Curated annotation (Swiss-Prot):
Protein name: Beta-toxin Cn5
Swiss-Prot/TrEMBL keywords: Cleavage on pair of basic residues, Disulfide bond, Ion channel impairing toxin, Neurotoxin, Secreted, Signal, Toxin, Voltage-gated sodium channel impairing toxin
Originating species: Centruroides noxius
Lineage, broadest ranks: Eukaryota, Metazoa, Ecdysozoa, Arthropoda, Chelicerata
Domain notes: Has the structural arrangement of an alpha-helix connected to antiparallel beta-sheets by disulfide bonds (CS-alpha/beta).
Family: Belongs to the long (4 C-C) scorpion toxin superfamily. Sodium channel inhibitor family. Beta subfamily.
GO MF term (any one): toxin activity
Claim: Secreted is one of the keywords in the record: yes
Cell location: Secreted
Domain of life: Eukaryota
Domain LCN-type CS-alpha/beta, first and last residues per copy: 1-66
Length: 66
């Protein structure tokens, strides 16, 4: 399961504006905690491809955000 970097506390995904493979997004989306294989900007959200079934994906099952 892939998906945006949804903040595990607020349920707010880390949204981009500049779509495609964002370098900054790559850093967070393909970060250690994330474990993803790819990190880019889908619909102004950090879409982490290669994501574990353990890594939460927007939106959170606790809280929602924009």
């Amino acid at each position: 399961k892939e998906g945006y970097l949804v903040n595990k506390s607020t349920g707010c995904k880390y949204g981009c504006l500049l779509l495609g493979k964002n370098e900054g997004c790559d850093k967070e989306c393909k970060a250690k905690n994330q474990g993803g294989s790819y990190g880019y900007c889908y619909a102004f959200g950090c879409w982490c491809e290669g994501l574990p079934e353990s890594t939460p994906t927007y939106p959170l099952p606790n809280k929602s955000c924009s």
